[model samples]
Target chain A: KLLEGKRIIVTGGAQGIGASVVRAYIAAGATVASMDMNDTLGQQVVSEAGKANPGCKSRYYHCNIADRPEVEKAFATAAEDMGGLDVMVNVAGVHRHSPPDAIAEELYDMLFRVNVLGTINTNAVAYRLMKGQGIGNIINFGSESGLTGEINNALYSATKAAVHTWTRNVARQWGPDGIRINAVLPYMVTPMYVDFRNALSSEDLAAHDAATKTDIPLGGKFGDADKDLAPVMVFLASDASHFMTGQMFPVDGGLIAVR
Target chain B: KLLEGKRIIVTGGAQGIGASVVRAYIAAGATVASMDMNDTLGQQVVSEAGKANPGCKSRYYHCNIADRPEVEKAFATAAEDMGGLDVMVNVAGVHRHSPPDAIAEELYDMLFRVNVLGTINTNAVAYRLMKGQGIGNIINFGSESGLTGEINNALYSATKAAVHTWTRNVARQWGPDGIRINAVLPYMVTPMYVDFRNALSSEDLAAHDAATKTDIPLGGKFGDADKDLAPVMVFLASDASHFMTGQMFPVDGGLIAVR
Candidate 1:
């Protein structure tokens, strides 16, 4: 009951890490509303969470975060459904891997539109709501790629770096107003990771695995989403991290160190 | 004559560090083309450089970096005028100080357009040219505010962070192709800095001054654009820095320790 009586919203809650965060938030006794572009998968997740929690409030809203007006309206509706907004978790982002020079203009536009601008839309909307209430918590998803630029993922890494820095900036801006904002850089097994891995050849995959084992000192593998990252999400979404603002919490099994 | 016979383009070369870079490049026997929105100042800079160093190829093209088409056209014209391009130095950006929560949407849009996307436009054009040349250097101006998020400069800092990471990622992507990209995080006294300082009230300015004395270890003051930073710019533009890429060189008088 770490988040008992809290009202929270998670974006991109259809599957992967977003799904795990939705489940974790519900189990912590929070009224949860999730926004995503996928309706069927989102509803299914919400339904499962409701079934498991019995009396918990869980709903899914169709929202494409890249559209500013659409995102603002969806967030408003979700906040209204949950009666109020106390926490906002922005897990909505897209990823693509390509060399910087080879990246098409379309790919670049999409990445920045969804990842960087999406975060701005959600965070700015939440800030307005929380400013009225004088208290709020915001959790954004960053990545090790943002901290240490990843090879073959040029645009994606840059977008995450923008998100991380934006998170830090807003945390400083909103701290005095009783709002706390933080970003989590998580290295976890998800569909996104699977897709990336599956795209690689066997030889390249083996090399990647070998590199991961050396890079991830704690477990020598990416963490399981539900077991490893969800707990930290809970803490960040809860009052426990009240004093923490303008910080990056790496739930990456020690992949990247935070100063 | 460190950059002797080099053909280079410097963006935002009307004033401040950009003007310094323009002068330094010409002094190093480079053919220089400067692009800036300020037509009068940019032309003046070009004329002065021509007067100081007779027969040098120093010209100015009016271009708004935030506009993709305008920037591309200007860069193409500059390259054609210079006969070819050896280095592309992007120093075009804007700054404004406001709390993140209090930032106007217009301001936010302006910052991202001019700083982040502007860098993208300039760099992409340069990359295409250099890809054919098989050798080139690109230097982007970042900031210490980007490394450590400033208190009131949220969007500006975030934009710089994006530029820094983008520089890193692209450096890696294009390194094997004989292209190098690096970002310079400079704390220098320029017209931009003077404008920022002039806006502050006496009391706040005093506090800021005191903070700077404690923060800057080497000189306890911001570096001079011509004297301190131009030498590094010369090195980066020449073959001396051929081995360095995808790195943030903080010429901030020990303000930021970069790994």
Candidate 2:
């Protein structure tokens, strides 16, 4: 119960990395408000969390982050419902594949609006709320794509790149107010890799898998989201990262450090 | 002429670091193309280079990189104009000194669209042109803001952070194409510091100057733009940085290397 009596809100908490974060936080004795656009998965997560730990409660909220008013309302409601907000994690994102020249304007706007602006909106609202409370932690989801450009995926890369910068600026601006902002840059993981592989041609998938193994310095298999990603997030949210802010920690099996 | 027969395109080459880069490359015997939005400054740069090295031919092009189409056209025209492109340096950027909340949405969009997307557009164009030509080098302008964060200047920090990551990705993605991409994360002498000091309250400015002297590990003033910033850019653009990519070299008087 590291987070005993704490109130946490995790955006995109219905599935994938966000879902895993909610589970981990609940297990640590924190009351979590899981915000997601997918109501079904959100409810499922809350129920599953209840089964694991009866004492802690997790609630689901349907929120479309691209809409500023919806985000503002969702966050305020979550904070009020949870009693107080101690940590807010922005984890919702969308990914698409397209060649650099062929990338559509709509695709570019969608990714940026959600991944970048979505993050900014979440941070802005959370900062305002947390500042009044005297302290808080904001963990923005970052990707290796943000750190490195992806061929045939320029739009996704650009959005992640924007988030990386946004995290740093938010940290600097809010650090004086006792609010710590940082980003966790993750690399290849089980769920994401599977999704990516399914999206790619057989030959391309094989090449990607081979590249992942050979290029990653840590020499680990694909990440188990709950096992690898959750702990890092928890650490960042906790007092352990007290002195650190405006920094990126690559929880990517040493992929960033490798080359 | 160390760079004899070399062909280079420098964005924002009209003044500041870009101008310095133009001067250095021309002195090293490279045929230089100075590209900028300001036609007068561009012409001045060309004339200045012409005076410095009678043997080297320096040309100027008007390019507004915020527009992708303009960037594409300018890059294509510059490549054809220069005969061949071997090195591309992106030194174009703007800095603002305001609180994060005070910055308008348009300003935020402009900064990233130019500093981040503009960098990508230029690099992509350069990559396509150079990869076919067999070899190339890319040098981007990054700032200490990318590594850390600034208090009031959140937008500036955000764009810089994107540039840092973008540089790394370009290096990784294009290395196999025989193109070397790196960035100069400068904390050297620039007009920004003067602006920063002048903007600060007199007492704050005095304290800042005193603190900066001690904080900088090199134990003195930041650095001269022409002498310090130029050499690093030249090194990265030359064969010296052949093995270096996906790396950020801090020319910050050792600010980044320290705490």
Candidate 3:
């Protein structure tokens, strides 16, 4: 209950990392407003949280944060619904894997708009909401792909990399206001990765899994969303991280590097 | 002539790190186009490069790259005049040092418009041109400030951080197109830092110098832009770096950490 009495807003809380962040925060005793694009999955998150902790207050909102007005309204409503915004963990992001030649403008623009601009928009909204209280914490997601440059992951990798730097910059901008910004670059096996694997042949998926193991230097390979990754997110979103700002933690099992 | 016969466009080419890159590229036998906002300084750069490297093909364009059409046209002209495009080194950026509480909306917007969005604009223009040719190289500027958030440097730091991730994304988006994207995080003492040092008081200056000694583990304290930093830039911008994409190089004299 490190985040006891805390109120948080987690963007992209419907599935994968975002969903886990929502779960962790709720379990940490924070009231959470999970914002996501998938209503079906998003509602399941609310139900799941409800089942896990009967006293926990949690709800899911439909949001397309790439649109500025929507991000503004969502944060406003979520904060109002949650009582106040003590922390913001933007675990919501998209990934596309394609060679440079195959990357269409639609995919590229979506990455910038949804990934880069969405981060900017959320940070802006959070800063506005957080500024009034003079205390805030933001947890942005980065990835090993950005750090190590995966063979065909430039699109998502780049967006995550941008998120990494943006987190540091915001940390600096908001530090004086008592708001801390930091990033977590994780190489996790999530529902999204599962989906990615589903689309591949068994042979390719096995090869992929083997490759993943070799790349991750740790005894265990990729992280689990809740067990491994979420706890770190909890640390970042809690008072324990007050002294640290504008930094990045690679919860990547050495698959990526950060200093 | 490490970059011998290369044709390149350098944004923010007239001053600071950009100037260093410009000088180094010309000396390396690359035909270069220098783009910057200051007309007076731009001409001076052209003159200085000519003097430093006799018979070098170096010219200047006073342009505000935030203006997309201008960036597109200028890059097109620069490429045509140079006979082809091989590399793009974006070093032009603006900086404002302020605390999060003191950060002005104007300053924030301006920095994004110039630094983050400016990066988006230039990279977009370059990608279009490079994709068709089946070859391209982009070296964006990242910073130690962005890497390890700086006090009173939230504004500039965020922009650079954005560039960091964006560079990696572009590498992914453009890699299979035969285009490579990377970044150089530099800590050279340029004219900008010179002015910064000049404004410091005696005690503060001494503290700053002392801190510099401890901070940079390597021999030379501040990096020499052309001598120390630009060689690495040339390396990233040349065929030598073909195998490397979506990566970052710290050109600091052992100041910042990167992976």
Candidate 4:
């Protein structure tokens, strides 16, 4: 119970990495409000948690974050439901596979609005609430695509790039308010990759997977979502990162640091 | 001629740091195209170059790089004017002071669109040309604002952060293309500080100047722009940095490496 008595709000917490985060936070003794647009998956998360640990405090709220009114309302409701909000983990994002020229303007705008603006809207609300409380932690989800340029995911890459910059700026802006903001650049093994792989033909998928394997400097496969991603998030969310802010931690199997 | 037969394009070259870059490149034996939006300053630059070294090749072109079309045209024309484009030094930027809440949305957009997207636009054009040519060097301007947060300057901080990440991504993307992209994060004495000082009230300015004198980790006033900025830019622009990319080298009198 590393987070005993702490209250956390996880955006996009219904499925995938967000669900994993919810499980990790619950295990660590934090009361969590799982906010996402997927009610079915959100309810499933709640059911799974109830089975795993009886009386675990976790609830779901449907939030289409692209709508500022809806996002704000969801957060307000979440704070009320959870008694207070202390930590915010923004893990909502969309992915697409298209070469630079093939990417549509609408798709680019949608990606930025959700991935980048969604983070901003949440952070803005979080910052206001957290500043009033005089202490908080914000952990934004970033990607290797944000840190490096990708050939086939130009729009997704750009939105992520924007998020990365916003994370640093927000950290600096809200640091003096006793609110710490950080981003986890996750390079983990998860269903996201499987979805990405499934979108491609067998030959393309094999070639892409092989290329990705060779590109990663670290040995073995992508990181396990539950085991690997949870610890890093915990470290960043806890007092362990007291003096850290405006810095990006790449959990990419040494991709950013290595050649 | 230090850059004998080399060709260079310098943004914001009509005045201040850009002018210094132009002078340095010309002194190094490179043919330089001084690109800026200021026609008067551009003419002065050309005149000064002719006076300094009658045989040296230097020209000026008015380019408002916030416009993508203008930027692209400027690069193409500058490359043609210089006979070739081997190195690009992006030195154009604007700084203003305001609290986070005080900053206008238009101002924020303009700063990012110019400082961040401007760099992207230039790099996109330069990368294409450089890739075709099989080798090039890109020296982007970064600031301590990007590296850390400051008081009352959120927009500037945001733009700088974007530029820093852009440099890293561009380096990874273009490294195999034989184009090296690096940034000089300088804290040297430039006119920007003067503007910063002027922006403050006299009493506040006096107190800040006094404090800054001692707070600087290096035991000195700010460094000379021409002396300090030029050397590092030359180093990054030269083969000396062949093995270096995706790096932010602070020419800030050891400000970054310290606490």
Candidate 5:
């Protein structure tokens, strides 16, 4: 019940990192609105959240957050349904890896539209709402790729850097307004990673796994989103992470040694 | 003359931080090509370099860098003009500070075009050239605000993070090419900051100066572009920082402690 009486909204809550966060928030005694582009998955997750937590409110909205108006209306409806909005957890993101010259415009635009514009729109909306309410928390997704660019993932990583800068900057800007913002850079065993691994050849998969282990200092293994990452998110969304802003928190097994 | 006989090209070398670096590199015995979009100012700076460092081979090239073919052609011509390109320093950047919501589409695109796209084009071109040479160095100008987002400056800072991520990641990708890339997140007294301060309201300016001092662990004042930051650039572009890659060296007054 660390987040008791809190009102929260999580983007990309249909599955993977975002879904884990939704589950964790509801279990921690918060009313939540899960927003995602996947209608079936988003509704299913929200429905289950209710059975898991009988008292707390859990709802879902299908939104292509890249569209500013759609995000604005959806987010407002969510806050209204939840009675109030206290925390905004933006896990909505996309990733791609290719040699810079080989990257297409569509891939580049998609990364920017969703990861950069989408996140900023929601953050700004939440900030205004939070300012009126007198306090708010924002947890944004940063990636090791963003901190240490992936070999073929320049576009994806750049967008994450965009998110990272926004998270840290707004924290400084809105700190006096009772808004606390931070970026969580996580290297996790999610559906995304699974797809990546599956897409690779056997030899490359073995090489990647071995390299991942050698690169990470703690365990050389990615964490379960719920087991390892969601706890960190809960802390940030709750009062526990109060006063910490303008920083990058890597819940990675030391995947990136540099800050 | 630490960089004696080295051939270097510095984007945005017409003025500000880039001008300081151009002067410093020339003083250190490097033949330099100053690449900038401002023809008048760029030519003027190149002329000053010659007078300041007699016998040094210093010149300027006009380039917008946002147009890929233009950047490619201009950068190639610059390398040819310099005889060879040993180091690439990207200091060409634009800055704007506004609440995220109020951020105009045009302003956002410009930042991405000049800052993100500009760096990549030059970097990619430099990478190909350096790859052929079998040894090279690249020092990109990152910023304190990019590392830690500042009040109302999300777009500018995000662009810096994009640069930072690219700087670090490319070091690994092109390491085998014998090209080492790194980012210098500097806090210096430059024309840009002077303009920003001069434009601020008196009360706002006072608050800003105070906040700045409180932010930097080192003395609150910004560093001299020539005295403080230029030295760091020389070292990175020289053999001194060899074996150092995928790192962001902060020349800030400890404004950002992470890097």
Candidate 6:
């Protein structure tokens, strides 16, 4: 009921934290459109949300955010279906790593297209729709790596830093139009993070585990998306954060501090 | 004689802060190559440096940093001529302003290509050369806009953010190879800043002047590149900054605080 009558779009909603946000938004009385490249999982997410929130209205759309044409079509369709866009949660991004000297041009280009250009496509489309309504909320996904940098994950960190600054810049640009933008640097337990952990040797895994105990001051590990993170996402989408803009919320158990 | 025998390459050496850096580095006794698209101005800068530092070795190389092939050719030639690179001062970038809602795709792409991709092209090329030597220093240019946000200059702010973060990421990745990378966020009096100030209306200019009085704690204004900033640049390029890497040094007059 917090987001009652709100029309929302959540990208990368097929799995991971995006899916959790989709469900949470639906349950909070927002009519949600979940977009992602994975059609089957996206459909499943919509169906599951419908089952849980019996009175909620929601749908799924296939969108590779990196493709401008696909993103335009998906956002237009979603806006028409939902009556108008009230909130845009741009949660979609990818990650890859390489030493500075080992990064090939093509590989860097791919990551930039998916992560940086993809953000532009989604946010720009949403901006047009939001500007038409004269009010909107845009939430972006940043990373702890963007704050302090991650060894072997240079490209990913760079893109997230771009996202964070882009959010701030647009927040200032759109603030006069009653649109608010902010970014969340979430350290959440998800399949992608698990995959990263699984790739490490047992010895290194133990070391990583030990490092988290000291790094994450809250629970000594990544937060659960549905529990720790979704509630904050709900609050952000609601009117609770109306005055907050151009800020980086490190929902990373105090791993990094921003003021 | 602080940088005696040091071989350094300064990008965007045709004017502004880049030209000042070229003069300072040569005066400090470094062998330098000044790279830029403006062959005329680049040659002038090299000539002036030669005149000012009579015994210094320095040359100008034509380069459009956004062009990968041009960057490669220029850097390779500079390296061969100077024997090897000890420091890379990547000071070239462009800026423009547009409201977020009014931003054209072409403009955004141009900024990304020139600011973000250009940084990658230069740094990656330098990374390869540096890794072979087992030691190197990289200094990148960031901005106050990247730290907070700049109204109507969203895209340029975003690119500088990417530069800042990219500097940090590569600093971590290349640290093991003895290559140190850091970024400088400077508010300096340069031709570019003068151009911006000249474009403002008298009333707006007065407001801007008043804002600086409160915004900048030291001297209530931007700094001189040669006097206020070049000394710090000399230190960053010298062995004095050997222990520092992956950090952002805000050389502004206490405008923004970073830890």
lDDT of every predicted structure (CA atoms)? 0.86, 0.79, 0.79, 0.75, 0.83, 0.87
TM-score of each: 0.91, 0.86, 0.74, 0.81, 0.88, 0.93
List per-candidate RMSD values in Å: 2.7, 3.6, 5.0, 4.2, 3.1, 2.4
The chain B TM-scores of all candidates, as shown, are 0.95, 0.92, 0.96, 0.92, 0.95, 0.97
CAPRI grade of model 5: medium
**What local lDDT does model 2 show for residue A37?**
90
Write candidate 4's Cα lDDT for B1-259 as tens digits: 4477778888988877888888877777788888888889877987787787779888888887666678778889888877789988889888776655344445655676668666766777777767787888988898777755566665576567667766776676678889888877777666777777779998998887687677567754677777877877777776778788878888877666512
- Name the 10 consecutive residues with the lowest summed lDDT in model 2 chain B: B97-106
lDDT score of residue B103 within candidate 4: 43
TM-score of chain A of each: 0.96, 0.93, 0.94, 0.92, 0.95, 0.96
TM-score of 6: 0.93
Q: Which stretches of candidate 2 lie over 4 Å from their true place?
A: A27-29, A47-57, A66-68, A97-109, A144-169, A186-192, A198-219, A227-259, B51-56, B98-104, B199-202
Candidate 4 has a TM-score of 0.81
Q: Candidate 5: lDDT of B24?
A: 90
DockQ values of all predictions: 0.54, 0.29, 0.24, 0.17, 0.52, 0.60
> What TM-score did chain B of candidate 2 earn?
0.92
Off by over 4 Å in 4: A1-5, A26-29, A37-71, A94-117, A143-176, A198-219, A231-259, B27-29, B38-44, B62-67, B96-108, B201-203, B215-219, B238-244
User: Considering only N, C-alpha and C atoms within 3 Å, which residue pairs clash in candidate 3?
Assistant: A154-B172, A158-B169, A161-B165, A162-B165, A173-B100, B12-B92
> Best DockQ goes to which candidate?
6
Give the Å shift of residue A15 in candidate 3: 3.6
Tens digit of per-residue lDDT, candidate 2, span A185-236 = 8764646667767999989978877987876767645677788777887787
Off by over 4 Å in 6: A67-73, A132-134, A199-201, B67-70
Name the 10 consecutive residues with the lowest summed lDDT in model 2 chain A.
Answer: A99-108
Model 6 per-residue lDDT tens digits across residues A178-255:
889999999898997899899999999999999998999998998998888888999899989999998888887888
Q: Which lDDT tens digits does candidate 2 get at residues B1-259?
A: 5677778899988877778888888888888888999899788988978887886777898888666678778888878877988888989888776676445556666776778777777777788889886788988888888755677766777677777776776676677888887778777656666776779998997888798888787865777768877777777777767788877788878877612
Instruction: Name the DockQ score for candidate 1.
Output: 0.54
How many backbone clashes are present in model 1? 0
Over the true interface residues, superposed, what is the Cα RMSD of model 3? 4.7
Model 1 residue A124 lDDT?
Answer: 82
